[PDB]
Short mmCIF file of C-alpha atoms and ligand atoms in Angstrom, two decimals:
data_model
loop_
_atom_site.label_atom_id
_atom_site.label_comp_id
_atom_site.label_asym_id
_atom_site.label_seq_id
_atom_site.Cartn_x
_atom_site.Cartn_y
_atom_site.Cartn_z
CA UNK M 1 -5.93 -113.59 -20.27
CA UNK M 2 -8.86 -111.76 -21.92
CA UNK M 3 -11.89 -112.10 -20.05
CA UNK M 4 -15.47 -111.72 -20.83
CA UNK M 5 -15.90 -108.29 -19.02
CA UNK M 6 -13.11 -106.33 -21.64
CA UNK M 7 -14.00 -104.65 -24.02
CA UNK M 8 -13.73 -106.19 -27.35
CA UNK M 9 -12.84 -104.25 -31.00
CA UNK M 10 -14.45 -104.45 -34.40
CA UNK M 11 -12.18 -102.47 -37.07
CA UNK M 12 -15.27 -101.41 -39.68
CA UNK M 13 -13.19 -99.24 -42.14
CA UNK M 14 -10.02 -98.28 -42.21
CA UNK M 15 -10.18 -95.64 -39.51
CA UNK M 16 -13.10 -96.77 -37.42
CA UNK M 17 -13.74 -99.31 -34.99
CA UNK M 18 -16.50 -100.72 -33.05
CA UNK M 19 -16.04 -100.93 -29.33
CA UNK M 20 -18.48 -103.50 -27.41
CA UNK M 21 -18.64 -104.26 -23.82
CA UNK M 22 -20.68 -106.33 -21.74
CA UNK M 23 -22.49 -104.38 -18.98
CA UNK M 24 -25.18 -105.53 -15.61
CA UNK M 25 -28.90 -104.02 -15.43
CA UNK M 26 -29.48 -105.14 -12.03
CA UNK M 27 -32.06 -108.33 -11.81
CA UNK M 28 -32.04 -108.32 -15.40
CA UNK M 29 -29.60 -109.77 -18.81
CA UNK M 30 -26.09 -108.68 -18.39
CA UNK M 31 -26.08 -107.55 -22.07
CA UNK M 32 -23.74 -105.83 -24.47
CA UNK M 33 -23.61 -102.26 -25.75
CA UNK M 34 -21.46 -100.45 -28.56
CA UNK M 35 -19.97 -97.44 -29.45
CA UNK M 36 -17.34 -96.29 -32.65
CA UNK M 37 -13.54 -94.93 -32.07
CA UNK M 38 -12.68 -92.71 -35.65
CA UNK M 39 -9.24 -91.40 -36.61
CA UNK M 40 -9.17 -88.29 -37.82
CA UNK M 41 -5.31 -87.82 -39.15
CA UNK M 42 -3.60 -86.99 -35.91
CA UNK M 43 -6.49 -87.35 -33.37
CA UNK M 44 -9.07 -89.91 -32.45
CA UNK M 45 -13.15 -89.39 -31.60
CA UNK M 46 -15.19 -91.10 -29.90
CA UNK M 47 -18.88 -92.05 -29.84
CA UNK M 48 -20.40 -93.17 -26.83
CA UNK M 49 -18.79 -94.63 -23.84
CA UNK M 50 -19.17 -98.49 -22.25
CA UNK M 51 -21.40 -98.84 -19.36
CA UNK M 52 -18.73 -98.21 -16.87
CA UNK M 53 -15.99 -96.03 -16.29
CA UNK M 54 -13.50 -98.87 -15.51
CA UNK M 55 -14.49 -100.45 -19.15
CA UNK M 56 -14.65 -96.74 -20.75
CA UNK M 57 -10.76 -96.96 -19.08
CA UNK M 58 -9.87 -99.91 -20.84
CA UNK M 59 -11.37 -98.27 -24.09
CA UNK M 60 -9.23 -95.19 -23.41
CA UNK M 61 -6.34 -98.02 -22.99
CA UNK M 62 -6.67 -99.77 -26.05
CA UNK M 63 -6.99 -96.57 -28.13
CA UNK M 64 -3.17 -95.80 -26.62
CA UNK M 65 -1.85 -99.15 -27.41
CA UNK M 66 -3.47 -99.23 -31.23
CA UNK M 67 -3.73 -96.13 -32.17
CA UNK M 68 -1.73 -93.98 -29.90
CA UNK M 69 -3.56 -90.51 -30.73
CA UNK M 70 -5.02 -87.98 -28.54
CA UNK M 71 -8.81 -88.36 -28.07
CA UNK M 72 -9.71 -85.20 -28.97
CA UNK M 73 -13.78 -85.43 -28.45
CA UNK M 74 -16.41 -87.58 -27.58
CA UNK M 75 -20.10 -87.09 -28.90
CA UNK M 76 -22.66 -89.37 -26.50
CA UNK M 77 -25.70 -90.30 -27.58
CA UNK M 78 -28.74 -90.24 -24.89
CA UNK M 79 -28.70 -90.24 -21.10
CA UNK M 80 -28.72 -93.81 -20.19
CA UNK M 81 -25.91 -95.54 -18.54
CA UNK M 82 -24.52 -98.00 -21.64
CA UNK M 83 -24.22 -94.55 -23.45
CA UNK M 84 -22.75 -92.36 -20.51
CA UNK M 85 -21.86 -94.22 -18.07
CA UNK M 86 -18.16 -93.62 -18.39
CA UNK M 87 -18.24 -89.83 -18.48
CA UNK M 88 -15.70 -89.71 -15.45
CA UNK M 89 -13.59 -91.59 -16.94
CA UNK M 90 -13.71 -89.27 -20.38
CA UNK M 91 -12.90 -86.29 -18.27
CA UNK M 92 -10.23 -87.77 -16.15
CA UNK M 93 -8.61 -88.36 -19.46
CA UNK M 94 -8.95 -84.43 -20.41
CA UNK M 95 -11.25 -85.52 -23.45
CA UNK M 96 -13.81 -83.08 -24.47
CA UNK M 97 -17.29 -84.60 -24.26
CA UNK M 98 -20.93 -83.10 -26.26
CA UNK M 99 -24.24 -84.38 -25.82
CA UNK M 100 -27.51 -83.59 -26.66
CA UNK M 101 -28.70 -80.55 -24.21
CA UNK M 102 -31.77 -82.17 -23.57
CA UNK M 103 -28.99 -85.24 -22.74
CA UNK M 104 -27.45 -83.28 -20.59
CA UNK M 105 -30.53 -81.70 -18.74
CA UNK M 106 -31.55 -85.34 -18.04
CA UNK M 107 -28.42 -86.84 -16.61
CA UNK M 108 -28.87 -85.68 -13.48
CA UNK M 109 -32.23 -87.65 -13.39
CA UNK M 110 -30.79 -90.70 -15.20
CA UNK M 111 -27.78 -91.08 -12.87
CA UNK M 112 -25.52 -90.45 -15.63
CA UNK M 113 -22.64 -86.87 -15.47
CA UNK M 114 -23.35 -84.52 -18.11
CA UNK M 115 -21.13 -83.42 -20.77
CA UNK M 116 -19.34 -80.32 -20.62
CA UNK M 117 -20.70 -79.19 -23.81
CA UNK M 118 -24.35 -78.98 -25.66
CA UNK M 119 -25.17 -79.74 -29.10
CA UNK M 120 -28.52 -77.86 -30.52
CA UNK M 121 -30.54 -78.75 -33.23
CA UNK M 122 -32.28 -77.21 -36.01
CA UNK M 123 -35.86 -78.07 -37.32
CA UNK M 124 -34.28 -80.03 -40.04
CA UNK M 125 -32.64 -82.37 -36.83
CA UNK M 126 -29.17 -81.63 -37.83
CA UNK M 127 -26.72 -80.51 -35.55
CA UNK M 128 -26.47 -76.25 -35.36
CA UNK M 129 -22.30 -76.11 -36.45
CA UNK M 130 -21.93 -73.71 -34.00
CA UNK M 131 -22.55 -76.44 -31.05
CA UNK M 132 -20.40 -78.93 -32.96
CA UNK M 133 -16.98 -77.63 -33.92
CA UNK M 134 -14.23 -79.73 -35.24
CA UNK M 135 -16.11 -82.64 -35.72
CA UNK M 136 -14.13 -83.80 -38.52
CA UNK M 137 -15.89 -86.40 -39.69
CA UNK M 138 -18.73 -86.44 -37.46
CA UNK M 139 -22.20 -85.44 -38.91
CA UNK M 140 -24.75 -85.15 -35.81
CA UNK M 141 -28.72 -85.83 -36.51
CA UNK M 142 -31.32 -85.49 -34.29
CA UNK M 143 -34.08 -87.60 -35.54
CA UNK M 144 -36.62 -87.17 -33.39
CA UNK M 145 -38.16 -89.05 -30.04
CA UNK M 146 -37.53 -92.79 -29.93
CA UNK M 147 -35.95 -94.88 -27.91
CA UNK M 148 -35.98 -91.91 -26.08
CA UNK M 149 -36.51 -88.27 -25.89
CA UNK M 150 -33.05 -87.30 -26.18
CA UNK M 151 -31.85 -89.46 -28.67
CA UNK M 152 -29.15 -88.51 -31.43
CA UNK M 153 -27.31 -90.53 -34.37
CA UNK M 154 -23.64 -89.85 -36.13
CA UNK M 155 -22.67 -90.81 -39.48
CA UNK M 156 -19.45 -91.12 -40.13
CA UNK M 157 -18.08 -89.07 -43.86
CA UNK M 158 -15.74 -90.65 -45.92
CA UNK M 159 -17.51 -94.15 -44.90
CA UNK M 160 -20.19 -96.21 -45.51
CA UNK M 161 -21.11 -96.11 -42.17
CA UNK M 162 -23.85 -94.62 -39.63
CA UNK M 163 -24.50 -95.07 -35.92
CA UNK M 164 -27.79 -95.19 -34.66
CA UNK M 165 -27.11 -96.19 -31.10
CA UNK M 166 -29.97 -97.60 -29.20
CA UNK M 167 -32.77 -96.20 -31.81
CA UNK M 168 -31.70 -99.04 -34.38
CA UNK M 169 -32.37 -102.95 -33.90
CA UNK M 170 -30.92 -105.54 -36.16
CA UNK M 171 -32.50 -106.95 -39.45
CA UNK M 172 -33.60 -110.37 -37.32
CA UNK M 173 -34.62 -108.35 -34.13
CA UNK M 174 -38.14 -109.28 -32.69
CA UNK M 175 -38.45 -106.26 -30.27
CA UNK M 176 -37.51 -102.42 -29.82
CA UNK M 177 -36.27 -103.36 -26.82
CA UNK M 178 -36.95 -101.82 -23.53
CA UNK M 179 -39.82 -98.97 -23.97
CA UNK M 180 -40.86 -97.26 -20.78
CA UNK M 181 -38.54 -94.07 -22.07
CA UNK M 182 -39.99 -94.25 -25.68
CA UNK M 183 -41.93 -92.36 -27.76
CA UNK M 184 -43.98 -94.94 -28.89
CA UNK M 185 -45.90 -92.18 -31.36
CA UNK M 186 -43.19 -91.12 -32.99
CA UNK M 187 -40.62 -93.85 -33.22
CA UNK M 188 -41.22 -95.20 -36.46
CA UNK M 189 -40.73 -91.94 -38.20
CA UNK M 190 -37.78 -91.12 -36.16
CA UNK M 191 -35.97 -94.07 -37.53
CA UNK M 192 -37.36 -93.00 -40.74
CA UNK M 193 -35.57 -89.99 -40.71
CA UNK M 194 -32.45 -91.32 -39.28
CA UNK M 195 -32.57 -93.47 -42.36
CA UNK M 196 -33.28 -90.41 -44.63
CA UNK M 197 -30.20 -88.28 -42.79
CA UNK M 198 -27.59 -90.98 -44.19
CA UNK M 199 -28.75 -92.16 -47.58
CA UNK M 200 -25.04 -93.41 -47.99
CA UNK M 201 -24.57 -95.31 -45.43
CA UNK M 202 -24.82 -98.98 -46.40
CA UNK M 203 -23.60 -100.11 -43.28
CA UNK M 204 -25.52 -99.64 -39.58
CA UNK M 205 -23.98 -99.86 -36.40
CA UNK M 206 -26.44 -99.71 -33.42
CA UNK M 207 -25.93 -100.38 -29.92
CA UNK M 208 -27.18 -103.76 -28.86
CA UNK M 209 -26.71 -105.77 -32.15
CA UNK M 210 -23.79 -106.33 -34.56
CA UNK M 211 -23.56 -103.99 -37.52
CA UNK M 212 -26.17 -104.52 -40.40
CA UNK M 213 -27.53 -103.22 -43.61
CA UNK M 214 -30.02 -100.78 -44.19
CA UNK M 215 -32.79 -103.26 -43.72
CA UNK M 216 -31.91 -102.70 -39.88
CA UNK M 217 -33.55 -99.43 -40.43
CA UNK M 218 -36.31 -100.20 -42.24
CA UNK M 219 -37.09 -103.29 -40.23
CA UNK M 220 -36.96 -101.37 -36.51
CA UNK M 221 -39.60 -98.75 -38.15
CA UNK M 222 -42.03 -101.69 -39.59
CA UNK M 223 -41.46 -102.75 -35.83
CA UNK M 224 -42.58 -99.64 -34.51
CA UNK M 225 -45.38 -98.90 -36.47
CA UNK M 226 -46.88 -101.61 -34.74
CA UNK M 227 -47.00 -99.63 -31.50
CA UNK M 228 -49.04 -96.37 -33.17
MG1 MG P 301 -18.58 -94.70 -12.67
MG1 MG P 302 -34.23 -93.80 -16.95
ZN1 ZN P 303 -30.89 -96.16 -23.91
ZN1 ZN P 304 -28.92 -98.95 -25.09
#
């Protein structure tokens, strides 16, 4: 029997899918956190892991089942544990993983393993190509400080879709969430230019809410205007 602890799949378009899984902050909500699986003709990507390896695992699992394609790559989105807290379980599975560099210089201090490769960014916030390679559809964007420092956001081409992990809250939201790694200065125009990056997108997938429409972006930035 399915049980509340599996992961649990969301086809969006024809070649992606949400993943969701429930994961425990000690003394806190056990709450739930999502990432996107895209086929890319004969290979599958992945952005961010659940908040355990074991769950990441049964990700990994599903994808065989479904889809059976190699995962070629895995692009993770900040240094917190419902983002990279399956790493090991990535690796064990020979997929390539890219974060953030300033990701991966702050895993170590988050508790979270680093990825074995480092995306750059230019000015602009999109990803340098050279860091990126073979990202099919993938299209990397920095937006600035946030939810954290290291925070980055994917839109998917060929879609009407864009993930902006934990920097985007849901049309109905009533808080940013947790703070004490934000950049409470710059948040609001981060998400601004998250927004900006993926004009097309007409569908946002975030981390801790169900997918929305754009008014998910503008929405979380009213929300954080508040805090300047
Ligand atoms: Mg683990
Ligand atoms: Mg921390
Ligand atoms: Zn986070
Ligand atoms: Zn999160």
């Amino acid at each position: 029997d399915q049980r509340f602890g599996d992961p649990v799949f969301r086809q969006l378009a024809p070649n992606v899918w949400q993943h969701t899984s429930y994961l425990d902050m000690p003394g806190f909500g056990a709450v739930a956190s999502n990432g996107l699986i895209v086929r890319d003709g004969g290979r599958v990507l992945m952005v961010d892991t659940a908040g355990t390896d074991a769950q990441t695992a049964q990700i990994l699992k599903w994808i065989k089942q479904e889809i059976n394609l190699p995962v070629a790559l895995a692009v993770v989105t900040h240094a917190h544990q419902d983002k990279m807290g399956g790493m090991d379980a990535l690796h064990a599975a020979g997929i390539a993983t890219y974060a953030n560099a300033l990701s991966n210089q702050l895993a170590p201090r988050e508790g979270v393993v680093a990825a074995q490769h480092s995306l750059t960014f230019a000015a602009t916030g999109w990803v340098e190509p050279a860091t990126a390679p073979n990202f099919g559809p993938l299209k990397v964007f920095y937006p600035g400080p946030g939810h954290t420092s290291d925070n980055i956001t994917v839109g998917i081409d060929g879609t009407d879709i864009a993930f902006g992990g934990c920097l985007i809250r849901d049309s109905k939201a009533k808080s940013l969430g947790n703070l004490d790694e934000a950049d409470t200065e710059h948040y609001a125009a981060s998400v601004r230019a998250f927004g900006a990056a993926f004009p097309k997108a007409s569908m946002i997938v975030m981390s801790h809410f169900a997918p929305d429409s754009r008014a998910a972006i503008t929405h979380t930035a009213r929300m954080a205007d508040k805090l300047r």
